[PDB]
Structure formats: C-alpha cells, structure tokens
Amino acid sequence: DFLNPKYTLENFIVGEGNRLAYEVVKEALENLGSLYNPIFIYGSVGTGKTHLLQAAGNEAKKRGYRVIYSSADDFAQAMVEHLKKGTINEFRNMYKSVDLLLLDDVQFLSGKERTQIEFFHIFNTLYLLEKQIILASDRHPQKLDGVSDRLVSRFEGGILVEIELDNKTRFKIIKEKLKEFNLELRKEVIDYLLENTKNVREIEGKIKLIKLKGFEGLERKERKERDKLMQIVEFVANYYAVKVEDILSDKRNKRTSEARKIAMYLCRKVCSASLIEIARAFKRKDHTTVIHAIRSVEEEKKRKFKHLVGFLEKQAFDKIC
Numbered sequence: 001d002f003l004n005p006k007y008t009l010e011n012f013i014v015g016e017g018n019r020l021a022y023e024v025v026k027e028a029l030e031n032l033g034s035l036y037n038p039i040f041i042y043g044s045v046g047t048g049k050t051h052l053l054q055a056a057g058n059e060a061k062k063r064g065y066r067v068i069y070s071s072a073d074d075f076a077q078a079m080v081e082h083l084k085k086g087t088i089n090e091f092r093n094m095y096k097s098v099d100l101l102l103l104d105d106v107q108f109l110s111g112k113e114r115t116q117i118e119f120f121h122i123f124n125t126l127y128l129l130e131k132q133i134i135l136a137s138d139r140h141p142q143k144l145d146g147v148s149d150r151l152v153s154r155f156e157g158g159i160l161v162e163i164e165l166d167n168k169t170r171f172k173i174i175k176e177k178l179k180e181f182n183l184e185l186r187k188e189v190i191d192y193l194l195e196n197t198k199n200v201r202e203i204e205g206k207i208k209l210i211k212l213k214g215f216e217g218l219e220r221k222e223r224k225e226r227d228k229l230m231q232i233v234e235f236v237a238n239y240y241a242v243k244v245e246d247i248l249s250d251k252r253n254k255r256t257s258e259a260r261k262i263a264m265y266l267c268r269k270v271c272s273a274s275l276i277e278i279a280r281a282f283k284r285k286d287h288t289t290v291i292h293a294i295r296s297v298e299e300e301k302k303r304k305f306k307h308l309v310g311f312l313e314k315q316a317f318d319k320i321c
C-alpha cells in the first residue's frame with residue numbers, strides 16, 4: 001500500500017486555507033466512492049497534499065479497505081517495469097482491485113503516454129465500480145500540459161479543491177514543531193519562524209540551525225550574512241560608478257538597472273543568498289524581478305560579458321567572503 005502511518009486526519013491541523021480539501025476528503029470517507037469521484041487536490045509545495053492523501057489512506061485501511069498509494073512517477077516507473085518483466089497484467093489487476101486509489105503528484109504524468117493510457121483504464125474501472133479515487137497535483141488540471149484531454153475532463157467531472165497553508169495554520173504548526181524539537185514557545189522564536197518560513201521543511205531547517213547555534217546565534221549569523229550582501233552592493237557601486245543610495249530602487253536608468261542585475265547576481269552566486277534574502281536585501285518584496293534579472297545575466301553568456309561578471313565574482317569573494 002505504501003502508507004506512512006505518521007500522517008493522520010487527526011494530526012492534520014485545519015485552517016481556512018485547507019478546510020475545503022479537509023472537509024471534502026472527510027465527507028468522502030463516510031461515503032467512499034459515492035459522493036465525490038474523483039477528488040483532485042492541488043496546491044503549492046508543502047501545503048498538505050501528501051499528508052492529506054496518506055491520512056485518508058490510513059483511515060480507509062484502519063476501517064478495512066484495500067488501499068494503494070503511489071506518486072505518479074513511481075507509478076510510471078512501476079508500470080514500465082512490469083511491462084518488460086511480462087507482468088503488465090499483475091500491474092493492472094493490482095490497481096483495479098482497490099477500494100481507494102491515491103495518486104500523488106499527477107503533474108508528473110506528462111509525457112508518459114503509456115502510463116496515462118494505463119491509468120485511464122484503471123481510473124475507468126475503479127470509477128464504474130464506484131471505487132474512490134483521490135488525486136493530488138501541484139497545479140490545476142487546466143494547467144496539466146502533457147496530460148491527455150480525456151484524463152483532464154474526467155478529473156473535471158469530480159471535485160477540484162485548492163489547498164493552502166495559511167498563516168494561522170503555520171503558526172499552530174510552528175508551535176507543534178517547537179515542542180517536537182524541545183524548544184520553548186517564546187514569542188520571538190515563534191515570530192522569527194512566522195516571518196521566515198512557508199513550509200514545514202523551512203521550519204525544520206531553521207530549527208536545526210537554532211539547536212546548533214542557539215536562537216541568538218542564528219540571528220547573529222543572519223545579521224552577518226545581510227552585512228555581506230550590503231558589502232556586495234557597496235562593491236558593485238565603487239566599480240560601476242553608482243552610489244549605494246541609488247543602487248537600491250526601481251529607478252530604470254541602465255546605469256543603475258544594469259548594476260542592480262549583476263549585484264543580485266553576485267548576491268546569489270557569490271554569497272549563496274536565497275531569492276527571498278536577495279529580494280529583502282534590495283528593498284522590494286515580490287518574486288518576478290529577481291528571477292528574470294538573474295536570467296538576463298545568463299543571456300549574456302551566449303566569451304564576452306562572462307569574463308567581466310567572472311572577474312567581479314572573484315573580487316567580491318576576496319573582499320567580502
């Protein structure tokens with residue numbers, strides 16, 4: 001079945017960002033295959049998709065139902081394996097015989113035509129038998145490029161629910177995590193974590209650093225990192241002939257805009273600063289900007305503009321790292 005007992009409906013914290021999904025999944029458990037079929041959950045990374053699929057599976061199993069969980073990529077890989085071993089038929093029969101199929105990360109179905117075809121047939125069978133299907137994806141079906149149209153209509157015949165990890169929810173999670181890892185529910189720590197994380201992965205990442213360096217050790221280290229990013233800005237300046245005060249704003253001047261690009265690039269490439277961190281460094285708050293900025297810098301790679309940047313990288317290192 002491939003279920004990890006640690007995920008449960010009971011330890012799924014509910015907030016207004018994941019309520020629909022949660023409620024729908026729960027309604028479905030009380031009337032397996034008869035109310036909603038299929039259920040298609042979507043949301044960005046670290047948002048509850050896998051947890052919710054697996055919590056449903058654990059419930060259905062604890063109730064006596066036959067369950068299979070699998071990510072689409074492993075599904076694809078398993079189907080190709082059975083096909084060459086001569087067992088494609090045990091592959092189908094396996095999947096066609098469950099009370100509850102959980103296919104996680106459906107996006108990865110793209111390109112895998114055979115896999116899609118084989119999944120359609122499994123989908124139909126379970127469906128005609130009113131067997132429950134729960135899918136999860138990082139994007140809405142309408143954004144599934146590379147997945148057949150027929151699979152997409154089918155998904156759209158069911159219930160589609162977006163899932164989010166909202167602030168009230170992270171907050172509660174953060175409290176749970178701090179007890180998990182034996183830290184204190186201290187306002188500053190809880191606050192620090194709220195401002196600097198979106199995932200549980202990032203929360204555990206910060207916690208790891210806190211246990212290692214102490215909460216105040218992390219603050220010091222991060223302060224130093226910010227200082228260095230500023231040192232890089234000072235650097236790009238003195239070389240480009242633009243002031244600092246200047247380099248930090250949306251002033252499109254190609255004498256600044258082109259210094260802003262390399263800088264961000266240097267912060268990214270020389271100090272290993274995250275996008276968010278770089279974004280914060282250069283007073284602004286959003287996505288786009290940075291990403292494509294660093295892109296443009298790679299457009300210049302097409303050996304010309306490379307040697308400059310290369311030279312700037314090396315100097316920045318010796319002077320700031």
Ligand SMILES: Nc1ncnc2c1ncn2[C@@H]1O[C@H](COP(=O)(O)OP(=O)(O)O)[C@@H](O)[C@H]1O
Nearest residue numbers: 011012013044045046047048049050051052200
């Ligand atoms: N509502 C929630 N309550 C408690 N923990 C959660 C919740 N949502 C996500 N998590 C935890 O965050 C981590 C990422 O969850 P996961 O289901 O893998 O997200 P996704 O599959 O959307 O990437 C898991 O450890 C999960 O248990």
Ligand SMILES: [Mg+2]
Nearest residue numbers: 046049050051
């Ligand atoms: Mg997941």
